[PDB]
């Protein structure tokens, strides 16, 4: 009884530690699988803000009266 | 694709200015003075809408 009193831990302490720790890592695993599914559909269709390789910037396209009428 | 539409030669015949290049270059400034008030309607038409077969009138 003295050994359990001065050194060891209650099963309540360890049990709730296990339960909280499973909650944490279940969040981690669900976010990881959701991450890779979001990544594969976002590479497939391209609608998302990740895989957008830079196209032409149209600010340099400056329409104006040219020399030749038929451009 | 959609084929093109072109006006026929029922409309594309105005009596041309059949003088050559020398006198037409020599008579330039007075051509800009008396006439060339209504040509800018033509030139504005041509520069706004980039389509001949439209501003031929």
Helix content bin of chain A:
55-70%
Estimated share of beta-strand residues of chain B: under 5%
Radius of gyration of chain A: 30 Å
**Quaternary structure:** part of a larger assembly
Order of helices and strands of chain B: HHH
Topology:
This is part of a larger assembly, with chains A (71 residues) and B (57 residues).
Chain A: H1 2-6, H2 11-45
Chain B: H1 21-26, H2 28-33, H3 39-48
List key phrases describing it.
part of a larger assembly, 2 chains, A: 71 residues, mainly alpha, 2 helices, 0% strand, rod-shaped, B: mainly alpha, 3 helices
Give an overview in words:
This is part of a larger assembly, with chains A (71 residues) and B (57 residues). Chain A has helices spanning 2-6, 11-45. With 71 residues, chain A is mainly α. Chain B is built from 3 helices and no strands.
Could you provide a short overview of the structure?
The PDB classes it as electron transport. The structure is cut from a larger assembly and holds chains A (about 70 residues) and B (about 55 residues). By secondary structure, chain A is mainly alpha-helical.
